[PDB]
Amino acid sequence: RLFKITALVPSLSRTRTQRELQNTYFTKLVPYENWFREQQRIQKAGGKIIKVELATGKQGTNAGL
Amino acid sequence: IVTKSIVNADAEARYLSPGELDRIKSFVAGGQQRLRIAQALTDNRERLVKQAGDQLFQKRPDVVSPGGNAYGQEMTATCLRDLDYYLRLVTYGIVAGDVTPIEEIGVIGVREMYKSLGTPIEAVGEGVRALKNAASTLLSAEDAAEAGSYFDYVVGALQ
Amino acid sequence: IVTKSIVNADAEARYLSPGELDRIKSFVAGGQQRLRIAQALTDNRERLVKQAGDQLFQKRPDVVSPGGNAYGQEMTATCLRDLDYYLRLVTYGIVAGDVTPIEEIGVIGVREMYKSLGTPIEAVGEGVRALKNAASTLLSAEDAAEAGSYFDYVVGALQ
Amino acid sequence: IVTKSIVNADAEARYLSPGELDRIKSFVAGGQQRLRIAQALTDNRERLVKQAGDQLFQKRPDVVSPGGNAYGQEMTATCLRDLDYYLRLVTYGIVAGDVTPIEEIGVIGVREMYKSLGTPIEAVGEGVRALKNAASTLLSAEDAAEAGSYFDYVVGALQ
Amino acid sequence: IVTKSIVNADAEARYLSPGELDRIKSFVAGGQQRLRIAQALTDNRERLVKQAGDQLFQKRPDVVSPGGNAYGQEMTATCLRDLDYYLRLVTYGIVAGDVTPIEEIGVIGVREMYKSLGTPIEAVGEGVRALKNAASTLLSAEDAAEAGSYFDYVVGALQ
Amino acid sequence: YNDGRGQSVEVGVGTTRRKPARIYRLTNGIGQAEKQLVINAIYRQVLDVFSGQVPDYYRRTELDSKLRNGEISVREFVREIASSEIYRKRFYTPYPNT
Amino acid sequence: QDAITAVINSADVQGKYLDTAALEKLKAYFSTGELRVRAATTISANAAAIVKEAVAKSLLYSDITRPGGNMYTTRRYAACIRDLDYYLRYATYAMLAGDPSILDERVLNGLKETYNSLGVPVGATVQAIQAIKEVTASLVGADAGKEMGIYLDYISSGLS
Amino acid sequence: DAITAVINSADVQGKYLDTAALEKLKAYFSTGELRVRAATTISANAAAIVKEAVAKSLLYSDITRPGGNMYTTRRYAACIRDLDYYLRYATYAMLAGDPSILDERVLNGLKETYNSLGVPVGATVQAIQAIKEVTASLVGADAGKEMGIYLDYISSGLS
Amino acid sequence: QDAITAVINSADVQGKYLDTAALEKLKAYFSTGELRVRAATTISANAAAIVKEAVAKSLLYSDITRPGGNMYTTRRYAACIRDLDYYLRYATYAMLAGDPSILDERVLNGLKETYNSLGVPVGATVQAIQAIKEVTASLVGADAGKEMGIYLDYISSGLS
Amino acid sequence: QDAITAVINSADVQGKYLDTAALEKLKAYFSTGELRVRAATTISANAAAIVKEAVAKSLLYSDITRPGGNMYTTRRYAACIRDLDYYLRYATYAMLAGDPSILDERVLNGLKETYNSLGVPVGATVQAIQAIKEVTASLVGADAGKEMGIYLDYISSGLS
Amino acid sequence: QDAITAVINSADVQGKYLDTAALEKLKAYFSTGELRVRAATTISANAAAIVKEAVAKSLLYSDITRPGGNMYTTRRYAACIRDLDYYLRYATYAMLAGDPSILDERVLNGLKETYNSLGVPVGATVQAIQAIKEVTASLVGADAGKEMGIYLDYISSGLS
Amino acid sequence: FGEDVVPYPRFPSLPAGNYLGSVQAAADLVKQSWSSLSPSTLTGR
């Protein structure tokens, strides 16, 4: 139900003067429904995905998630 | 005032302003007088707390009424300890120049706390107002304006 | 310093802090000396601008070189007018105590402007540094620290 | 329960569920008994309000103490009118099946209100608990479970 | 506007002077913009009466008050029907290009009618002002100017 | 020549519309009062609190725990607080979809 | 707003409680609510077939679906389907509430200005809503059909 | 501010800050001392000010009765927060010495908001006048009328 | 997940339908669900008094509430109240579901690492949860009290 | 929209196909599209020099750039540069499309109300756009220069 | 965290007030705070020249700025400039606070893993930070220069 | 925006006529009641 993600996304636009440490490197909990498109956004931005982990869910659950 | 200036210039992308450096210079220049005020309030801890608490019980007899919260010797001792804690935080705020020590030690979640303790907020606030009046009578005049305005922040933030 | 304190207490939900009210009190107390510094800089407008511009052309002869931007009487008159504008903004910042008049009149979009004008930024900055040195020599010593630190903001913000 | 089901199926893109239509059918089937409970509570308005208020003043004598808010005939009449208002909202919630009439008429902003009125929240809550006990003694047993659980929502939402 | 020039040249024994023919040709040219403005005010009538009643009862609450004339649903429906009538006459004056077919039906005897109906005329003028404001929000700049023309005539006429 | 008085600094876009008053960024390690101020700023922008000193609008307990821990990202909080029925009751059902 | 919340709001503006007149209104609402639930199920059964039969009866093979009409383009045809699907769904909601004010506040707030600005014809929408009314009256029944038709005619009168 | 207003007026002129603007700034500094003291004594008991104002003006009337704008609990809390807002902004406009920030902050859209919501204007004007009397009694004479200038500016902007 | 959805998921992994063993489990769940509803009402009555009595019995007047402890600061005390309150609310949810997996997935996912990283003591939380268990067992009853205590002890075992 | 999509839309409202009149319009558009590409390159070469020469010819050393004018402040001067840079870029886009409707829909939608509300003078913008027109007509050529000037004069007429 | 808030936090963990030892630490901090303000002004004067002199002394004309190095690309060179600009700015902040914990929490939290994952060399950054330390020590003075160098060496030790 | 950045109201100049729309959008002020269970009468009392 909840994924534990950890990914880096570099800056391929112009360089930013704000620190932006979190954007470059983050670890966040994403729900299962949003995770496909949110991954696809990191897929688009050319960033590496380091660590994917199921936080809450169990594999192979047919009912009740 | 250094932490607040640094985080305010941190929210922007720029350095510390000349105005803010003037603020830090004036704070350094007034810091010795603030240490004198902290010296007087440290050494007058007992009688200030007792006079303020007894002024509170003169104004508000509901807390020491048997239906009230501060009924009994132990409960009223914890009442005076709460007033001691708030006077200690007022001295910290007078020294620092910020109210961030007062805030993140004793202001930020006090309403939910005193709601769950059964204690009325307004009587705490009246006791800190009594502390303000007592420390205003002890100190020098515009020095008492300085101390009582931090007391005023605590009083307005408790309610 | 009143506008910045008000917008900083506006970003939070709370009033003006006792620390900030001490800042406003100290700013009021130093305001008369700041008006004296503004009086001296207003009355020394001509020779300060001319000495700073000629110190710039002593340091940087590229602008008055015929490949440079400030080639000719009219171009160098506009050069001295730019230095006049920046000295005027420095006097505004010395009076206000903020750097928000300096910023939102002459700092905020100056890089893109002088890029489109063909003018080098660093020579503007060296001219304002020459203004800082000249006004430092004219004024009283720690008064010159006050004036030159606003000049220092303008110099560091132009580059 | 129709409004809440409709807005819950409105947040989704789909129609009303078979489960929710069973909920509406069961609510219609119990609606006549709910009108009977509303009939009893309408006709017992006086003595329920007076017994609950006097049970409150037996439990909490601070409000009718001269330092308290409900000191005097007019203030205590407004106290009983507040208890009347809350019993009226409880009857509305028993009829509707939702607590949205109780909420958007008397729950949603009551803390800030009674903070600005100087009135303690917990004594209001104790009075509504006394109303719950009185209306529980008047009605039939599991009918009193029904009435007292809406009373329980009001009591838990006031604190 | 053609009847105006025709009776104007008809009181004289002369023909229509060709400057009047120029103004008729120019009105004939502008008739398409007049028709679009009239259709835009036509299809959006109930919005304009709603916002006019909004701004009027917001401005003058005495018609809402029971001593005033527009008290109750029937009287307030007659009030919004009067505003509907005046919007209709304004569209007639927008098409006709000159204020004769709107003054002939709404202006020429309105003061004694509203005097022997009990209603004040200033509230009707404020209602047509609210209609002008709502139509100014509904239309573009060159359309709102040309609509506020005839709305302005009605507002000046009712006073 | 200041014949029509020219134009002041704020006549066009303005000083206030040009730059926001403060921009709040979450970090791993930060002051606790600053953390509470950023968390209140998300409610103030998203839920339209009308500059209330205290947000009367209800705060999800799990969300405040997750955001002080920093384990979920801030845009995830924005999604979860926008989909909650506080925002639904305040802005979806009274208004048409357009 | 329901019929129940309308009754409660009317009694609250009066400042009194719910005595026998309001109670009899509530008993009336409960007695019709049974068949209202059954009609909601039988409407949510074949909403797509209702919209399909309505557009096939009214809007198809006309000038608006031909080149040079408002329903010519494929995105415009899909917007037409979703608008009629909405009118059916919100008429179902207003049927189950027994109260048209939620329907008015939901769609009749801005759909007049939207259909004005986009150039959508009003009368073709009124004909399509009338075709929905006939199809649902034939599908559901007599009294629940006219209960549906009351709010569908409320939509059609609000657009006009 | 008043300072930025002086700077903007001189900038429109295109000249510097000579003696007339300097004397305005000295005037602003001399009143800024008592302005700081009034800001502290207003931030002391803002809740008591709003409580006394609503108890003097808005309570026990038709608008707080069933069938009024302040009947509902949500609406009463919105009333408290709006009066709290008028006091806080009037404090900000007092400390700036300039009402344009107050105008741009609240008088931008509060007219249309109170129009669309059906909020009565005159009851708000009475409540703002009650705030003006309470703060004039609490603070003092000259700082009280300094507060009352911007509170009357709010009350005139809403009307 | 409920007990019902757990029964359905177990039968679905088997690939068969709901015959008599699963039906008897469902009848058992219905028979206890009546008293589960009554216990949910009597727990939602005085949740604040339950947390107050629990902290007054266990956490107050100790070293952690003194200066130099985890519950010294006012924001830390409020976090303790909220945390204690959460354990009561989610134990109520897991009581009404008849199934602790929703409780596990909700809080025991990350609360171990959170209390590790913040330096929150585990054993004081276990004592506070046990005090909640005693207070709710005294307040509600015997069998609903031990039904509450099963999931509260599940929380206390998951934190340890 | 292009000239091609304009031709297709005109034939689609007619409901017929693309026969010889539309085909001859398309052949005309292709023949001018070659020099349109060459002009786009030579405009994107020195857009900054074009804006610099235009403001130096028209806007500098006047009352609006003096204290007490709309272009006095440094942020206002930068907004002026970016607005003229826009007018050049969108006139390049409308030149390459061969169609001014994209230009109209892009900027002339709201720039009238924006320059009304901000107090920006219209006639100084018209003079600046005319100076851009002269600079680009001198830089590019005769026929591509007047092709650029058609859309620049369209902008200047839309602002007025 | 400042030096003042560090003193207050140390006394708060003790549970006592601010008597003479903490007061003497605060008097010491005030006496150095004057020259700290003067150094902050003279550092914010020419931060760009400091970064320029540092990269010209250390990083230029080496293998990392050549093709086949970490600083070859134009975006990588700009990232290098902004990273050194950061190290100077946060060393200025840590100088004015008199306390390096804000600096540590601010950049040394994740910059180790970031420079690990991106393949950024550590030792070249240490050399660049040392060049910044020499340039600021030559520019500001002796004692404020070594006060700056304490936190710059703290950064360089945290990256290593 | 950014990720750790809270959303903040900003007025862009690149899309055409968007400045005016954003000024009018931030100038409406949520001119309706969110719950609207009981409507207050005309001018309240």
Ligand SMILES: CCC1=C(C)/C(=C/C2=NC(=C\c3[nH]c(/C=C4\NC(=O)[C@H](C)[C@H]4CC)c(C)c3CCC(=O)O)/C(CCC(=O)O)=C2C)NC1=O
């Ligand atoms: C404000 C506190 C803070 C810092 C310091 C910070 C650094 C930081 N440096 C980065 C990249 C980088 N950092 C460097 C740095 C260097 N290359 C070298 O050879 C030298 C040893 C060193 C320059 C002195 C380079 C070249 C990249 C880009 C590498 C790439 O193309 O992916 C990135 C990845 C995204 C990016 O900016 O492109 C971050 C987040 N972020 C922060 O929040």
Ligand SMILES: CCC1=C(C)/C(=C/C2=NC(=C\c3[nH]c(/C=C4\NC(=O)[C@H](C)[C@H]4CC)c(C)c3CCC(=O)O)/C(CCC(=O)O)=C2C)NC1=O
């Ligand atoms: C430094 C910030 C800080 C504060 C403020 C604080 C308050 C505090 N007050 C407490 C009790 C108490 N507090 C009061 C207070 C009062 N009696 C009244 O009626 C007055 C309104 C008020 C006096 C101001 C009373 C009567 C108790 C005992 C209540 C009980 O034992 O249940 C307790 C629980 C027992 C204890 O640990 O002492 C705490 C933690 N703790 C803190 O760390």
Ligand SMILES: CCC1=C(C)/C(=C/C2=NC(=C\c3[nH]c(/C=C4\NC(=O)[C@H](C)[C@H]4CC)c(C)c3CCC(=O)O)/C(CCC(=O)O)=C2C)NC1=O
């Ligand atoms: C109050 C804020 C403010 C500033 C700063 C400002 C600058 C400014 N400098 C200009 C020109 C100029 N500015 C310079 C500047 C310089 N020569 C150099 O090499 C030096 C680096 C620099 C002297 C500091 C030159 C040479 C010109 C003439 C360029 C031209 O005519 O194309 C112009 C265009 C002509 C004019 O209107 O005077 C403006 C608007 N205007 C303002 O309103």
Ligand SMILES: CCC1=C(C)/C(=C/C2=NC(=C\c3[nH]c(/C=C4\NC(=O)[C@H](C)[C@H]4CC)c(C)c3CCC(=O)O)/C(CCC(=O)O)=C2C)NC1=O
């Ligand atoms: C339908 C929702 C609703 C509520 C709840 C409500 C309360 C309400 N309580 C009031 C006063 C009051 N309310 C109380 C209440 C109490 N005395 C206590 O100590 C107890 C805790 C509490 C009894 C429950 C008192 C003493 C006053 C008089 C205070 C004053 O006059 O300043 C007033 C102002 C005077 C008035 O208009 O009657 C309102 C509007 N109004 C509403 O429309």
Ligand SMILES: CCC1=C(C)/C(=C/C2=NC(=C\c3[nH]c(/C=C4\NC(=O)[C@H](C)[C@H]4CC)c(C)c3CCC(=O)O)/C(CCC(=O)O)=C2C)NC1=O
């Ligand atoms: C097209 C030309 C035309 C006009 C001008 C006109 C006016 C008109 N207004 C009337 C009533 C009315 N008119 C109003 C007017 C108002 N409500 C107020 O408070 C304001 C003062 C004002 C409108 C905002 C009211 C309240 C009544 C009902 C008065 C009554 O019943 O005695 C009536 C009598 C009832 C009726 O037959 O409609 C006439 C004839 N009729 C016309 O055919």
Ligand SMILES: CCC1=C(C)/C(=C/C2=NC(=C\c3[nH]c(/C=C4\NC(=O)[C@H](C)[C@H]4CC)c(C)c3CCC(=O)O)/C(CCC(=O)O)=C2C)NC1=O
């Ligand atoms: C891409 C299509 C497009 C355009 C063109 C556009 C223009 C635009 N110009 C603006 C302001 C402005 N525009 C100007 C323009 C001028 N001043 C003059 O005297 C001259 C007549 C003219 C320069 C040639 C100035 C000075 C401002 C800022 C005024 C202020 O300080 O508020 C603003 C308000 C926000 C801002 O940028 O500061 C917008 C949105 N937005 C768009 O999306």
Ligand SMILES: CCC1=C(C)/C(=C/C2=NC(=C\c3[nH]c(/C=C4\NC(=O)[C@H](C)[C@H]4CC)c(C)c3CCC(=O)O)/C(CCC(=O)O)=C2C)NC1=O
């Ligand atoms: C809803 C499921 C759920 C839970 C339970 C949860 C807990 C949680 N507890 C926290 C902190 C905390 N938790 C405690 C708890 C305690 N201190 C003690 O000594 C006791 C042993 C225990 C109280 C009984 C304290 C004191 C903090 C704040 C520590 C700090 O100042 O950083 C935090 C960090 C952010 C914060 O709330 O301040 C989270 C996320 N989050 C969730 O989503």
Ligand SMILES: CCC1=C(C)/C(=C/C2=NC(=C\c3[nH]c(/C=C4\NC(=O)[C@H](C)[C@H]4CC)c(C)c3CCC(=O)O)/C(CCC(=O)O)=C2C)NC1=O
């Ligand atoms: C849920 C309440 C609700 C409704 C009803 C609603 C309608 C709505 N219909 C729209 C367009 C449209 N509506 C139609 C409708 C029709 N064309 C006809 O000829 C018929 C008369 C009618 C179909 C029966 C068409 C063709 C468009 C697209 C027109 C275009 O291409 O711009 C649009 C503009 C955006 C879009 O959907 O493309 C809205 C917002 N929005 C809402 O929130």
Ligand SMILES: CCC1=C(C)/C(=C/C2=NC(=C\c3[nH]c(/C=C4\NC(=O)[C@H](C)[C@H]4CC)c(C)c3CCC(=O)O)/C(CCC(=O)O)=C2C)NC1=O
């Ligand atoms: C910061 C500048 C600013 C202000 C002032 C502001 C006001 C404002 N007041 C509102 C409502 C309201 N305002 C009131 C105010 C009052 N009722 C009365 O009887 C009194 C006369 C007055 C209280 C003193 C009430 C009762 C509502 C809610 C009405 C409803 O239920 O719709 C709303 C609609 C949304 C809401 O808050 O519920 C706005 C936007 N917005 C702003 O951005």
